[PDB]
Amino acid sequence: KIKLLKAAFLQYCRKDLGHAQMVVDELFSSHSDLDSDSELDRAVTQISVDLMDDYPASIILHQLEDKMKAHSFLMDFIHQVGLFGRLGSFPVRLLLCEHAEKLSAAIVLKNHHSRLSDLVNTAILIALNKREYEIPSNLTPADVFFREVSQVDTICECLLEHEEQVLRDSIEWAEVVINVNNILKDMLQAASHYRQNRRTVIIRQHEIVLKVAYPQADSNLRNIVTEQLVALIDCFLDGYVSQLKSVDKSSNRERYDNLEMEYLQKRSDLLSPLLSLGQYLWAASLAEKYCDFDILVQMCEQTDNQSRLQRYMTQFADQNFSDFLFRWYLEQHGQLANFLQAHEHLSWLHEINSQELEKAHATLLGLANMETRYFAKKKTLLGLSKLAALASDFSEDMLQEK
Amino acid sequence: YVHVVEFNPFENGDSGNLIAYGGNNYVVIGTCTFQEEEADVEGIQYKTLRTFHHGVRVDGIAWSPETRLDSLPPVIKFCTSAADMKIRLFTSDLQDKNEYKVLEGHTDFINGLVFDPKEGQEIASVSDDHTCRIWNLEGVQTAHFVLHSPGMSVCWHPEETFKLMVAEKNGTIRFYDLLAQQAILSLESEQVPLMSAHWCLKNTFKVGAVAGNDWLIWDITRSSYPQNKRPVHMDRACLFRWSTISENLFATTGYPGKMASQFQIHHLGHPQPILMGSVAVGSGLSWHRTLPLCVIGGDHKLLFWVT
Amino acid sequence: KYSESAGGFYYVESGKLFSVTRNRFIHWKTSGDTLELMEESLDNLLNNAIRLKFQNCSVLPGGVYVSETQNRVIILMLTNQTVHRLLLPHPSRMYRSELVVDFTDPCNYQLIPAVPGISPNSTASTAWLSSDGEALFALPCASGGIFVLKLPPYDIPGMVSVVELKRGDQSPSDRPLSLAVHCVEHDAFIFALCQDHKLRMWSYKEQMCLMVADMLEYVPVKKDLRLTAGTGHKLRLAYSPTMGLYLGIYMHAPKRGQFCIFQLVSTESNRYSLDHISSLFTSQETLIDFALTSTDIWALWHDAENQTVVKYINFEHNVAGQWNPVFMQPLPEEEIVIRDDQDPREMYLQSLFTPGQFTNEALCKALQIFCRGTERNLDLSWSELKKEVTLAVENELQGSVTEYEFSQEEFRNLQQEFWCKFYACCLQYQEALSHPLALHLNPHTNMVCLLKKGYLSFLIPSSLVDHLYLLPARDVICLIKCLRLIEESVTVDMSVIMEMSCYNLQSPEKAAEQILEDMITIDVENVMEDICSKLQEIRNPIHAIGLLIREMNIRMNLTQLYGSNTAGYIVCRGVHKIASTRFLICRDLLILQQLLMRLGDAVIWGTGQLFQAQQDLLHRTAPLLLSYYLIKWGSECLATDVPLDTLESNLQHLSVLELTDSGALMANRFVSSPQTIVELFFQEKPEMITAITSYLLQLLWPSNPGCLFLECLMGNCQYVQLQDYIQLLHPWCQVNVGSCRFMLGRCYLVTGEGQKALECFCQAASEVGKEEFLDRLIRSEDGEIVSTPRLQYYDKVLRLLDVIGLPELVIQLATSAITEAGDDWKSQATLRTCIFKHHLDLGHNSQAYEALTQIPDSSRQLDCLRQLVVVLCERSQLQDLVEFPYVNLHNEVVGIIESRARAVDLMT
């Protein structure tokens, strides 16, 4: 209730100077509590989340640095006493502290690069949610916006999309769409770089990836090369986040894991189709970031004349040839693609080219046995099988049997 | 609600491409045809045939095995649920309503309904008034039967008209019969509320999900195999088993903090697989008869993704 | 190891009270392998169980090693010849908080005299016999020595100088059997009885015997030519009690059984040091303990067959404590398999959890039934205990099969046999562990408290229902007894059917002539004529029954409040028992009324009771049915799940909300999925007066309060927790209450069922509201200077759908509200504007141009038309908005063109 939150928050302020008074409050609370992992464990997590969210919401840089410095000291005092668990994530609202730290790290990076468009976007996002106070404080929202970083990131795409309609896109107008993408990438990288030292968010990235692809068809080569890096860096982070979210739940409930796998595979195939018309250097980076979706790599290594790429991507993997053959059978460079696809039915030529007389003879015999609607074709297949068996250097008994 | 005619394409084999979508007005009907387009993306397109009229909100949908298709005419017989706490079961042809549905006998709000086909028209409903209605329409008028048992999701067993299943709101799964009354009664997780308890496609198992992502399987053909796993998120719309794989089930969800809903595919032995993941809330979902396409009904449209 | 795990060697219960501010501080303690202590006062809400581990349990002489001073918490024990001294604050610091940290020295064990096997072992400890109870402590050896240890504290907290002071004799005949302690005019006056039948009064100042009295009680008396040597020696127990300023003593006198009542008044003067003006009473002997209180002497007895017998002797020259005790009634050998409660383990669990007497016995039985894995007390929480027991019982009974099927007949028999074996084991494990020990009274609460062995109980007088259910101008007695005897002879299936029929008669009731046709399925023959012949030979019957029922509506006098744990649990148990008794009485009355006026589905057999012969019983059956429903709801409600812990003053203090180990550990008030009954007792001697009296008056009242108490209780419980049981409580309640529909809608919306919540809110939107649940709709309906039936709710739903993000549902609601306009008032423009806004926000079809041209042709509302045109132009509809504007008027089109042409911002 309200008595536990007012008591747990008072002991954290006095723990920075002493330790004997804060250790007596946890031992008595652990004995007075019900000590149950059903409903009693959710009461401590709800108070901890409220105490952690209040520290981040209280000199714009100094105020943001003080909250980030005070939030890190609260995690050590709770871990030294314990507070040995109390996990209450579930849906929407241990992961709460990480999310709060990521939000505090992403909110501090946006304040250092304050510009004319960023301030206008922040004001438009603050005015669209609620009303601001008329008594000075022209910021207009810092403590109330740092705790909810998902609202500022989702509303940033609406401000740039409104100005792009009246921009007549033209040279100087293309920099405004790249400045927001660079800021978004820098804010997303800060939340991912801080974790290693321990529906609304994906829509803003999916819309940005689609809007950045339309502006590359009427811009300079340098601008198109610079705008494609932010989209690739965002896609590599989104794929990593999806893999981390999917690898955190398994064993039981296989239906959810099977449903999420299809959604994760469909999102990677759509982004690889839009990037195939531009530079081919992003495919290797995407494959190194996310070790999945080999159909895109197999198509990139087949559409061009890079014969060594298919072998390099197969010798440094795990069971890549079996997947490449299955992808080729289900679909210079043209000759290599035809030889890779020739595995079933018409495989005698491939077996003869790959030095396999016995395999070619077996394939010809199988084709002649399966065929039953062309006497000329059945005779030609039998003749080819006989020629392959005569040319093969096998045993005398096998040759006589053939 | 959105549910395809899985029984018509199995126990009969006629109207397999029919898909009912009950909304606030009435219930629309769709057709799933296999056109060209692309075989790697989706080789099954959805075509809106006709839409019937009623005037009341339909909370559920359950087709029977008496549906046929002759030339352009199509006789259907599905059991829905009116908004006035009732379980209607009319039989219209194509788009015109040839018969009405006099549903009266539910004391509280209904929760689930089903329809079977043995000697005429057997329908089993379940309300919140601790009563399990069993309407049977034979040749001599009809026969009403009520039993003091709480239900939430009643479903008949496959290839067994004399057996049925009923899942209570407190976590009790009773398997009653039409002659020996109740026979067995199971119980899953009693600490949280239950969702549903439907059988598998092999007509020999009974999978029961809960509201707190607590699923339990009890296959009788696997020498009494009692598996129990847990999903990723909570399943508000229970779960839907596959028509070919008995160890596979799909359960939708809805994260309100990220404004994105995902449908994880639960499987015994496999890992967490989320093939479906839209940015909107899903009202219902149903698998096709080919075990490859998923007809997920949203709040304003209906998608058809193929895995 | 199962029978020697729990039991307890003795039981001690202290309790001091100040004569300045009336400070109450009561606490209970238990013995056994570890020193346990729990807070069980009656004043101070949040408590916790304390368990102090020892080295050798409680090695002493027998029932000693149990002393407590007036301060909290000063305790003194003696285990393995080692006197201990625990000083901590278990009343408003350690026990009041949930912390388990202590930065002070509480334990301070010391050895005053040489207490050993070959030297002088103690036999009776009495720390309150000296002056300072928190410093000095007297002890009595078996050889007649009365030692003391005055441990006065110095300047530093912890160190103390113990003053060794002993006064031994030289013979074994001066050994004290039981010493007493009392304070008279702020002076320590100890009174002990030696083994040589000599009552010696010792003082704490001079440390010597001040008075001495001789008592001849050792000569060989003969009764009916039978020489009996009076050498009766009891094991510990108590032979001297106290109340305030005087003390009492009694002698068993061999095997006579007459006891005594020698209450000696010890005045503090210089001419009468000891005076006794009392002989002996005719009551039984106190083999356990005896607590005297002014004129009432509460005695406790215990036999050799683990059977206790409490009896009160109030010396008031009028009436004493006449009370009869009940034995063990086995009610688990009857099989039942009807409707309502199906399955097999659920009914057994519900029958076992309806008792509320065994705690560790069930856990011990479950651990012993599951071999190869018997651990310790690792259960902790009681929420998963039932699931673990069910999983252990389901994995032990193998189901026999046959020919591709499952033999249910053998499985049911095996389950019944397992349940019977578990019940027998639970009854055998609790019969040898639940027995009396001692009894102590408190001066602050002034209530007769009892202390057993692991089961804290209390003594209360017999009420009206308890005296009427015992089957023991003066009528309405024989008929009620016959009705109760006829109702008690029914089977379990008939009772289950009656309960299932009464549970479904809450909302859609049908109280008519249908109970006689349903209660006649018990194959009754010669049982109805005998009742009819007795009912037909009575003059005034209904008029007497109504007067007897009115004299019984309970009414309270001076209402009070409380706030504890054990007292609250006892009050809840008493309220549940009273509700069960009331439900049984109502069922018996209904059965009697159905058997008397059964008619028989005939006109000639029914016209005899409707020919103006009596005064009917419509309102008599309606209040009886309401009371029966309330009693059934109270019996269905358990006793945990409280609400708030706001202890104010009189008739305002609430009970403890939590006071448990965790959320899943049902220790006092934690389980909320199957309880919700403690809040009604907390929001409304103190089980005798007036916590139970207020609850009884609130449950018996109907038209005086104006509303149902169940709806108010549900609304008060929904504000805290118990969200899982709220959906089950709202579905079985009446629909006649105004707040019941709102509570049901809130429970349906908080659980996820949006359709049920919408259906419940749409059916109540045409009447009144539920504060913020319909204040906006009420304001919107009042702003139109009218009262819409189905238009205001539709407009509110459309506004809520448009303000969220929907477009088709809001447009449909606006169209429905515009079509259903039965008011025909001047405020019809609000619906038209909403419909136009919905059509402009959605679009899709070309029907949006019809409303814009109609709203602008009736009045001067061009702003809505301009907004709709702007929305249609911004929604990418250049090829559709040009053709839709030609079908409207010319003036409106010209105005729209003039409003759209005024654009000072040119973009792409």
mmCIF file of N, CA, C and O in Angstrom, chain A residues 328-379:
data_model
loop_
_atom_site.group_PDB
_atom_site.id
_atom_site.type_symbol
_atom_site.label_atom_id
_atom_site.label_comp_id
_atom_site.label_asym_id
_atom_site.label_seq_id
_atom_site.Cartn_x
_atom_site.Cartn_y
_atom_site.Cartn_z
ATOM 1 N N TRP A 328 18.387 -23.629 -53.704
ATOM 2 C CA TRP A 328 18.579 -23.625 -55.150
ATOM 3 C C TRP A 328 17.611 -24.563 -55.860
ATOM 4 O O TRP A 328 17.148 -24.245 -56.962
ATOM 5 N N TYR A 329 17.293 -25.710 -55.254
ATOM 6 C CA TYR A 329 16.370 -26.649 -55.881
ATOM 7 C C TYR A 329 14.925 -26.174 -55.816
ATOM 8 O O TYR A 329 14.104 -26.613 -56.627
ATOM 9 N N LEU A 330 14.596 -25.287 -54.877
ATOM 10 C CA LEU A 330 13.239 -24.774 -54.740
ATOM 11 C C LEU A 330 13.002 -23.497 -55.533
ATOM 12 O O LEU A 330 11.859 -23.024 -55.586
ATOM 13 N N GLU A 331 14.036 -22.930 -56.144
ATOM 14 C CA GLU A 331 13.890 -21.706 -56.923
ATOM 15 C C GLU A 331 13.793 -22.013 -58.413
ATOM 16 O O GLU A 331 13.991 -23.150 -58.835
ATOM 17 N N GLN A 332 28.879 -18.101 -66.785
ATOM 18 C CA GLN A 332 29.478 -17.593 -65.557
ATOM 19 C C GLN A 332 28.497 -17.681 -64.392
ATOM 20 O O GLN A 332 28.293 -18.752 -63.819
ATOM 21 N N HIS A 333 27.889 -16.542 -64.048
ATOM 22 C CA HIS A 333 26.937 -16.517 -62.942
ATOM 23 C C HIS A 333 25.702 -17.350 -63.256
ATOM 24 O O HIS A 333 25.220 -18.105 -62.403
ATOM 25 N N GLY A 334 25.175 -17.228 -64.476
ATOM 26 C CA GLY A 334 24.019 -18.026 -64.854
ATOM 27 C C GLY A 334 24.321 -19.512 -64.882
ATOM 28 O O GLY A 334 23.510 -20.328 -64.438
ATOM 29 N N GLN A 335 25.497 -19.882 -65.395
ATOM 30 C CA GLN A 335 25.884 -21.288 -65.414
ATOM 31 C C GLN A 335 26.053 -21.830 -64.000
ATOM 32 O O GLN A 335 25.644 -22.959 -63.706
ATOM 33 N N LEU A 336 26.649 -21.036 -63.105
ATOM 34 C CA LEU A 336 26.804 -21.467 -61.721
ATOM 35 C C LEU A 336 25.450 -21.626 -61.039
ATOM 36 O O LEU A 336 25.235 -22.587 -60.291
ATOM 37 N N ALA A 337 24.524 -20.696 -61.290
ATOM 38 C CA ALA A 337 23.191 -20.807 -60.706
ATOM 39 C C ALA A 337 22.461 -22.036 -61.233
ATOM 40 O O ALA A 337 21.786 -22.740 -60.472
ATOM 41 N N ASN A 338 22.589 -22.314 -62.533
ATOM 42 C CA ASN A 338 21.949 -23.496 -63.103
ATOM 43 C C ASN A 338 22.545 -24.777 -62.534
ATOM 44 O O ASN A 338 21.815 -25.732 -62.246
ATOM 45 N N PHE A 339 23.868 -24.814 -62.357
ATOM 46 C CA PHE A 339 24.502 -25.995 -61.782
ATOM 47 C C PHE A 339 24.126 -26.180 -60.318
ATOM 48 O O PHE A 339 24.010 -27.316 -59.847
ATOM 49 N N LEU A 340 23.930 -25.081 -59.583
ATOM 50 C CA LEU A 340 23.522 -25.192 -58.187
ATOM 51 C C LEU A 340 22.066 -25.625 -58.069
ATOM 52 O O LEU A 340 21.705 -26.365 -57.147
ATOM 53 N N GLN A 341 21.213 -25.172 -58.991
ATOM 54 C CA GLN A 341 19.805 -25.548 -58.947
ATOM 55 C C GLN A 341 19.570 -26.956 -59.477
ATOM 56 O O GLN A 341 18.586 -27.598 -59.095
ATOM 57 N N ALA A 342 20.449 -27.450 -60.350
ATOM 58 C CA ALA A 342 20.293 -28.786 -60.912
ATOM 59 C C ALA A 342 20.672 -29.854 -59.896
ATOM 60 O O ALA A 342 21.836 -30.256 -59.814
ATOM 61 N N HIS A 343 19.695 -30.319 -59.120
ATOM 62 C CA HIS A 343 19.939 -31.357 -58.126
ATOM 63 C C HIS A 343 18.929 -32.488 -58.274
ATOM 64 O O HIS A 343 19.255 -33.655 -58.036
ATOM 65 N N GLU A 344 17.705 -32.150 -58.670
ATOM 66 C CA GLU A 344 16.644 -33.122 -58.864
ATOM 67 C C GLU A 344 16.254 -33.180 -60.336
ATOM 68 O O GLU A 344 16.530 -32.258 -61.109
ATOM 69 N N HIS A 345 15.605 -34.286 -60.708
ATOM 70 C CA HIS A 345 15.157 -34.525 -62.076
ATOM 71 C C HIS A 345 16.315 -34.430 -63.061
ATOM 72 O O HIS A 345 16.988 -35.429 -63.335
ATOM 73 N N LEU A 346 16.554 -33.235 -63.598
ATOM 74 C CA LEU A 346 17.636 -33.009 -64.556
ATOM 75 C C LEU A 346 18.936 -32.808 -63.781
ATOM 76 O O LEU A 346 19.403 -31.688 -63.550
ATOM 77 N N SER A 347 19.531 -33.928 -63.370
ATOM 78 C CA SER A 347 20.774 -33.918 -62.613
ATOM 79 C C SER A 347 21.889 -34.711 -63.280
ATOM 80 O O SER A 347 23.006 -34.738 -62.752
ATOM 81 N N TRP A 348 21.620 -35.354 -64.421
ATOM 82 C CA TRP A 348 22.657 -36.129 -65.095
ATOM 83 C C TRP A 348 23.782 -35.233 -65.597
ATOM 84 O O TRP A 348 24.960 -35.582 -65.477
ATOM 85 N N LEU A 349 23.438 -34.070 -66.157
ATOM 86 C CA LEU A 349 24.462 -33.144 -66.624
ATOM 87 C C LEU A 349 25.308 -32.629 -65.466
ATOM 88 O O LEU A 349 26.534 -32.517 -65.581
ATOM 89 N N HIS A 350 24.671 -32.319 -64.334
ATOM 90 C CA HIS A 350 25.417 -31.852 -63.170
ATOM 91 C C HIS A 350 26.329 -32.945 -62.624
ATOM 92 O O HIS A 350 27.466 -32.666 -62.219
ATOM 93 N N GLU A 351 25.855 -34.193 -62.612
ATOM 94 C CA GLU A 351 26.683 -35.292 -62.127
ATOM 95 C C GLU A 351 27.848 -35.565 -63.070
ATOM 96 O O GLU A 351 28.937 -35.944 -62.625
ATOM 97 N N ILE A 352 27.638 -35.379 -64.374
ATOM 98 C CA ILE A 352 28.721 -35.585 -65.332
ATOM 99 C C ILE A 352 29.736 -34.454 -65.242
ATOM 100 O O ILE A 352 30.940 -34.662 -65.435
ATOM 101 N N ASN A 353 29.273 -33.236 -64.950
ATOM 102 C CA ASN A 353 30.190 -32.108 -64.832
ATOM 103 C C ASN A 353 30.966 -32.146 -63.520
ATOM 104 O O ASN A 353 32.117 -31.701 -63.471
ATOM 105 N N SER A 354 30.357 -32.666 -62.453
ATOM 106 C CA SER A 354 30.999 -32.755 -61.151
ATOM 107 C C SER A 354 31.748 -34.069 -60.951
ATOM 108 O O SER A 354 32.064 -34.420 -59.808
ATOM 109 N N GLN A 355 32.033 -34.796 -62.034
ATOM 110 C CA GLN A 355 32.750 -36.072 -61.994
ATOM 111 C C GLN A 355 32.027 -37.073 -61.087
ATOM 112 O O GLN A 355 32.425 -37.346 -59.953
ATOM 113 N N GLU A 356 30.933 -37.618 -61.634
ATOM 114 C CA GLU A 356 30.112 -38.602 -60.927
ATOM 115 C C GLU A 356 29.385 -39.438 -61.985
ATOM 116 O O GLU A 356 28.186 -39.285 -62.231
ATOM 117 N N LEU A 357 30.139 -40.342 -62.619
ATOM 118 C CA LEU A 357 29.565 -41.181 -63.666
ATOM 119 C C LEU A 357 28.523 -42.139 -63.100
ATOM 120 O O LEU A 357 27.467 -42.346 -63.710
ATOM 121 N N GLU A 358 28.799 -42.729 -61.934
ATOM 122 C CA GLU A 358 27.834 -43.634 -61.319
ATOM 123 C C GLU A 358 26.560 -42.899 -60.922
ATOM 124 O O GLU A 358 25.452 -43.407 -61.123
ATOM 125 N N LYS A 359 26.699 -41.695 -60.360
ATOM 126 C CA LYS A 359 25.523 -40.913 -59.994
ATOM 127 C C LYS A 359 24.723 -40.507 -61.225
ATOM 128 O O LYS A 359 23.487 -40.533 -61.204
ATOM 129 N N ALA A 360 25.410 -40.137 -62.309
ATOM 130 C CA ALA A 360 24.710 -39.785 -63.541
ATOM 131 C C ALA A 360 23.971 -40.987 -64.115
ATOM 132 O O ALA A 360 22.832 -40.858 -64.580
ATOM 133 N N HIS A 361 24.600 -42.165 -64.085
ATOM 134 C CA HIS A 361 23.938 -43.369 -64.576
ATOM 135 C C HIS A 361 22.725 -43.720 -63.723
ATOM 136 O O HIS A 361 21.677 -44.108 -64.250
ATOM 137 N N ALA A 362 22.846 -43.579 -62.399
ATOM 138 C CA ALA A 362 21.714 -43.856 -61.522
ATOM 139 C C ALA A 362 20.573 -42.879 -61.770
ATOM 140 O O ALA A 362 19.401 -43.274 -61.797
ATOM 141 N N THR A 363 20.893 -41.596 -61.958
ATOM 142 C CA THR A 363 19.858 -40.608 -62.240
ATOM 143 C C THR A 363 19.180 -40.882 -63.577
ATOM 144 O O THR A 363 17.955 -40.753 -63.695
ATOM 145 N N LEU A 364 19.959 -41.266 -64.593
ATOM 146 C CA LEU A 364 19.373 -41.584 -65.891
ATOM 147 C C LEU A 364 18.477 -42.815 -65.806
ATOM 148 O O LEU A 364 17.399 -42.844 -66.408
ATOM 149 N N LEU A 365 18.904 -43.835 -65.055
ATOM 150 C CA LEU A 365 18.074 -45.023 -64.885
ATOM 151 C C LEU A 365 16.784 -44.691 -64.145
ATOM 152 O O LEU A 365 15.707 -45.177 -64.508
ATOM 153 N N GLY A 366 16.872 -43.857 -63.107
ATOM 154 C CA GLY A 366 15.670 -43.450 -62.398
ATOM 155 C C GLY A 366 14.720 -42.654 -63.271
ATOM 156 O O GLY A 366 13.503 -42.848 -63.217
ATOM 157 N N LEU A 367 15.262 -41.755 -64.097
ATOM 158 C CA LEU A 367 14.420 -40.981 -65.004
ATOM 159 C C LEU A 367 13.761 -41.878 -66.045
ATOM 160 O O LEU A 367 12.584 -41.691 -66.373
ATOM 161 N N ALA A 368 14.501 -42.858 -66.569
ATOM 162 C CA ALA A 368 13.924 -43.779 -67.542
ATOM 163 C C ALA A 368 12.861 -44.669 -66.911
ATOM 164 O O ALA A 368 11.876 -45.017 -67.572
ATOM 165 N N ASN A 369 13.037 -45.045 -65.643
ATOM 166 C CA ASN A 369 12.032 -45.862 -64.973
ATOM 167 C C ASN A 369 10.795 -45.051 -64.613
ATOM 168 O O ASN A 369 9.680 -45.582 -64.624
ATOM 169 N N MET A 370 10.967 -43.766 -64.292
ATOM 170 C CA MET A 370 9.825 -42.927 -63.948
ATOM 171 C C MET A 370 9.071 -42.449 -65.182
ATOM 172 O O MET A 370 7.863 -42.193 -65.102
ATOM 173 N N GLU A 371 9.752 -42.317 -66.317
ATOM 174 C CA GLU A 371 9.108 -41.862 -67.539
ATOM 175 C C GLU A 371 8.301 -42.990 -68.172
ATOM 176 O O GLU A 371 8.744 -44.139 -68.218
ATOM 177 N N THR A 372 7.102 -42.648 -68.662
ATOM 178 C CA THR A 372 6.236 -43.638 -69.295
ATOM 179 C C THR A 372 5.298 -43.001 -70.316
ATOM 180 O O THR A 372 4.169 -43.468 -70.493
ATOM 181 N N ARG A 373 5.746 -41.937 -70.989
ATOM 182 C CA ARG A 373 4.910 -41.265 -71.978
ATOM 183 C C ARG A 373 5.689 -40.840 -73.217
ATOM 184 O O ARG A 373 5.162 -40.055 -74.017
ATOM 185 N N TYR A 374 6.916 -41.323 -73.402
ATOM 186 C CA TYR A 374 7.718 -40.958 -74.568
ATOM 187 C C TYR A 374 8.721 -42.075 -74.818
ATOM 188 O O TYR A 374 9.687 -42.218 -74.062
ATOM 189 N N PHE A 375 8.489 -42.858 -75.875
ATOM 190 C CA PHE A 375 9.392 -43.963 -76.190
ATOM 191 C C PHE A 375 10.772 -43.455 -76.587
ATOM 192 O O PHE A 375 11.790 -44.040 -76.199
ATOM 193 N N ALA A 376 10.828 -42.360 -77.350
ATOM 194 C CA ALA A 376 12.118 -41.804 -77.749
ATOM 195 C C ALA A 376 12.904 -41.317 -76.539
ATOM 196 O O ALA A 376 14.113 -41.558 -76.433
ATOM 197 N N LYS A 377 12.235 -40.632 -75.608
ATOM 198 C CA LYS A 377 12.916 -40.163 -74.405
ATOM 199 C C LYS A 377 13.350 -41.330 -73.526
ATOM 200 O O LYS A 377 14.436 -41.295 -72.935
ATOM 201 N N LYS A 378 12.519 -42.371 -73.431
ATOM 202 C CA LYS A 378 12.885 -43.537 -72.634
ATOM 203 C C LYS A 378 14.081 -44.263 -73.236
ATOM 204 O O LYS A 378 14.923 -44.796 -72.502
ATOM 205 N N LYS A 379 14.172 -44.297 -74.567
ATOM 206 C CA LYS A 379 15.325 -44.920 -75.211
ATOM 207 C C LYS A 379 16.574 -44.064 -75.047
ATOM 208 O O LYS A 379 17.670 -44.592 -74.821
#
